[PDB]
Write a protein that binds this ligand. Structure first.
Ligand code: GDP
Ligand code: MG
Lengths: 351, 171
């Protein structure tokens, strides 16, 4: 009687893109795969991933800086087995986890399924998949570095107002739907697009009362909903949430790709395709040690390179960073404290 | 032969000021808040009629956060017309108009058409840049000026028509 976590580990091991999977089976994998969540990595880890399932099984994969991969499975009965996994060209294990790697090339994936690209829903759905796959780190210099220049972070509060209620947001693996996102917009004191957060939230975080209301409207288990309230009550939660939406995180990656993105924009405008310019999907976690990690993804339509005309895909830009304790929701403090990595991949459809 | 003229338009101006909202109001006569920020460049198309002439407008909506300036500036050179937007409730956005015109000077075509637009003019209780101030400025530069509201639709259509007439005359 096989567990959720066990199931996913089997797939990842055999290969999520394995040609011997019956497609109806690829359905199943999505539902499992999207429970996967990036979380705070330890000092010699390149990436750490966690998934807590509704049958009470959990899974934890570590990837060392040397790219050695171990899984830890907890069955609902709370038995622990620790599995040592190998990634190779048949399973593509490392390609199929939310991890950034130091590759010499931007990683390319193939979307599995009839995930078209006609509208808002399909695009979100695409980003919903790609942001569980790997990405290739991109360096910046002083010109592209999203935190350098005369006004780093100027736009965050605006970015947060426009993002909340239009994002896919996850706090400790708990899905925060649009309604609850709106409450969160209010709770931070960002009622309108011109204001900053309330002096009170900046210093004491969200009131327990708002925090409690937000989690009641949200999805996931009662034990998980508990950590969300505890999470939002920190002053640092405000900092993680707003910083997550900074638009310029995307500059390193576009500096590499924008012409191909614009090309896709025009292709779509010329056909009356009602596609959003961009989509966001954020995952924020606080470990049982109180460590706060943010992973933010922006998905954006992009044309294949010249050799494959009229084909269209998504570029996903991933931004990861710890929010250290004591770092409060102010522009000035976000700048000299936060240290993001940027990574990107390109995903193409099965059309 | 399905349009008589084809003009490229560019919308530049600070982040927050309502560039996407203006474009959305012009293209679809809608205003909502269900959109996340513009990442890089956005693009829309609207055909208008002007003196019995069918004008296809290709409009590009840029991101105005400082770090985007460089990549964004590659879109200036093809443009027929450039609209500079500021927020009538945000003094800093108006001060920056001066920089945006330098970017135009630096990257636009030499005889590109300009228009200055002061958006959000429905926020009367919050307005901090006076019409006469902005209008005097646009004058010293010989640039046309309007205040608008993507929200109420105030002067949005005028804005683009004006720009289109301006270009039509040049050609
Ligand atoms: N009251 C009012 N608000 C506006 C108007 N235009 C834009 N806004 C608000 O300002 C926000 C930013 O608009 P946006 O188009 O994203 O600015 P952009 O960075 O130039 O694309 C929007 O979410 C709107 O809520 C307007 O004409 N009137
Ligand atoms: Mg915009």
């Amino acid at each position: 009687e096989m567990s959720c976590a066990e199931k996913l580990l089997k797939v990842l091991s055999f290969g999520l893109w394995n040609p011997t999977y019956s497609r109806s089976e690829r359905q199943s994998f999505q539902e499992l795969l999207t429970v996967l969540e990036p979380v705070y990595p330890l000092p010699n880890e390149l990436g750490r991933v966690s998934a807590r399932f509704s049958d009470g099984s959990s899974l934890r994969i570590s990837v060392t800086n040397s790219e050695s991969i171990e899984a830890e499975i907890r069955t609902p009965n709370n038995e622990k087995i620790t599995v040592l996994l190998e990634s190779n060209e048949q399973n593509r294990l490392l390609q199929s986890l939310p991890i950034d790697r130091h590759m010499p090339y931007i990683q390319v994936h193939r979307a599995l399924s009839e995930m078209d690209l006609t509208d808002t829903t399909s695009m979100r759905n695409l980003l919903g998949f790609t942001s569980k796959l790997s990405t290739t780190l991109i360096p910046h210099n002083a010109q592209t570095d999203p935190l350098s220049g005369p006004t780093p972070f100027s736009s965050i509060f605006m970015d947060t107002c426009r993002g909340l209620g239009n994002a896919k947001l996850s706090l400790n693996g708990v899905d925060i739907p649009a309604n609850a996102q709106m409450l969160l917009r209010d709770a931070l004191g960002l009622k309108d697009t011109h204001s900053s957060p309330t002096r009170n939230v900046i210093d004491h975080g969200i009131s327990r009362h708002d925090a409690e209301q937000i989690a009641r409207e949200s999805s996931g288990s009662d034990k998980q909903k508990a950590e969300v309230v505890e999470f939002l009550c920190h002053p640092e939660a405000a900092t993680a949430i707003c910083s997550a939406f900074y638009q310029s995180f995307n500059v390193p990656a576009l500096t590499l790709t924008h012409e191909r993105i614009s090309k896709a924009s025009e292709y779509n405008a010329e056909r009356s395709l009602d596609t959003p310019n961009a989509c966001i999907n954020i995952s924020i976690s606080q470990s049982s040690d109180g460590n706060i990690y943010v992973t933010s993804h922006t998905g954006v339509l992009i044309m294949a390179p010249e050799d494959r005309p009229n084909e269209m895909g998504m570029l996903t830009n991933r931004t990861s960073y710890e929010v250290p304790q004591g770092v409060k929701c102010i522009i000035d403090e976000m700048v000299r404290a936060l240290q993001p990595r940027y990574a990107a991949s390109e995903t193409y459809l099965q059309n | 032969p399905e349009y008589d003229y084809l003009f490229k338009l560019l919308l530049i101006g600070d982040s927050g000021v309502g560039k996407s909202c203006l474009l959305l109001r012009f293209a679809d006569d809608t205003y909502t808040e269900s959109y996340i920020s513009t990442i890089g460049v956005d693009f829309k198309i609207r055909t208008i009629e002007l003196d019995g002439k069918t004008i296809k407008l290709q409009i590009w909506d840029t991101a105005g956060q400082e770090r985007f300036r460089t990549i964004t500036s590659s879109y200036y050179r093809g443009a027929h017309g450039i609209i500079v937007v500021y927020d009538v409730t945000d003094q800093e956005s108006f001060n920056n108009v001066k920089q945006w015109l330098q970017e135009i000077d630096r990257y636009a075509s030499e005889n590109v058409n300009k228009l200055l637009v002061g958006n959000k003019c429905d926020l009367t209780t919050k307005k901090v840049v006076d019409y006469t101030t902005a209008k005097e400025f646009a004058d010293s530069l010989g640039i046309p000026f309007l205040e608008t509201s993507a929200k109420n639709a105030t002067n949005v259509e005028q804005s683009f028509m004006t720009m289109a007439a301006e270009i039509k005359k040049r050609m």
